[PDB]
Amino acid sequence: LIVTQTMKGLDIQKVAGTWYSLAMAASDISLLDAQSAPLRVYVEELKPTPEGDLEILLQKWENGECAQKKIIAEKTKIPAVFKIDALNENKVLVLDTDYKKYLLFCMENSAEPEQSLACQCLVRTPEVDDEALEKFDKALKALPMHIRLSFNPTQLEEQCHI
Ligand SMILES: CCCCCCCC(=O)O
Ligand SMILES: [Cl-]
């Protein structure tokens, strides 16, 4: 555990729909450095299931191509925290959202020696929301981040933010 910010009172069904990854940060440079870096993922849509799991549609660079991916994050006993199945146990946490404009979330590993982590500022539209970004930066102050990326509206309308 590293991130101890979660949203009190989350209604997961209300996060459904279109999002844009306006900004991303991570604990290690190599996690976002290259265009093909492991956690350089661009969110397209959040699809909560009727039973409260979180399906995530995204893009990422995998060949010399922007590939689509569909990730399933299963619910836990905590409403703001979800679990993605792999060789390793890695968790999605929702830190804060107003549903209609912005959503902040993190992805974190288990162990490791000492966890690695990436967070994003998701917004509803291809616009630079400075207030969403302030709230993202505030959340990140509590976190050991060493790379931060931000996208302009032009890139936000392109596949893989080209
Ligand atoms: C919450 C989205 C999870 C990001 C990493 C998923 C692994 C991948 O798609 O390569
Ligand atoms: Cl949950």
Q: Of 18, 41, 13, whose CA–CA distance to 126 is shortest?
A: 18
Enter the resolution in angstroms.
1.9
Tell whether ligand 1 has an atom less than 6 A from the beta carbon of residue 56: yes
Q: Are 100 and 76 in contact (CB under 8 A)?
A: no
Going from the Cα of 41 to the center of ligand 1, the distance in angstroms, rounded, reads: 7
| Exposed/middle/buried for residue 152 (C-beta within 10 Å: 0-12, 13-18, 19+) | exposed
Helix (H, G, I), strand (E, B) or coil at 161: helix
Q: Side chain identity at 51, as an amino acid letter?
A: E
Going from the Cα of 130 to the center of ligand 2, the distance in angstroms, rounded, reads: 29
Nearest CA to ligand 1 atom 4: 39
Q: Of 61, 56, 59, whose CA–CA distance to 33 is shortest?
A: 61
Q: How was this structure determined?
A: X-ray
Q: Which domains does the chain have, with CATH numbers?
A: 1-162 (2.40.128.20)
Please report the DSSP string for 1-52 in residue order. -------TT--GGGG-EE-EEEEEEESSGGGTSSTT-TT--EEEEEEE-TTS
Residues within 5 Å of ion ligand 2, judged at the Cβ atom: 75-76
- How long is the chain? 162
Of all ligands present, the nearest one to the C-alpha of 122 is: 1
Q: Are 66 and 81 in contact (CB under 8 A)?
A: no
**100-134 residues labelled b (16+ CB within 10 A) or e (exposed):** eebbbbbbbbeeeeebbbbbbbbbbeeeebeebbe
CB atoms within 10 A of CB 24: 26
Q: What is the 3-state secondary structure (H, E, C) of 120-144?
A: EEEECCCCCCHHHHHHHHHHHHCCC
How far is Cα 113 from Cα 146, in angstroms, rounded to an integer? 17
To test the ligand 1 pocket, which listed residue (41, 92, 95, 160) has its Cβ within 8 A of the most ligand atoms?
Answer: 41
**42-73 residues labelled b (16+ CB within 10 A) or e (exposed):** bbbebebeeeeebebebbbbeeeebeeeebeb
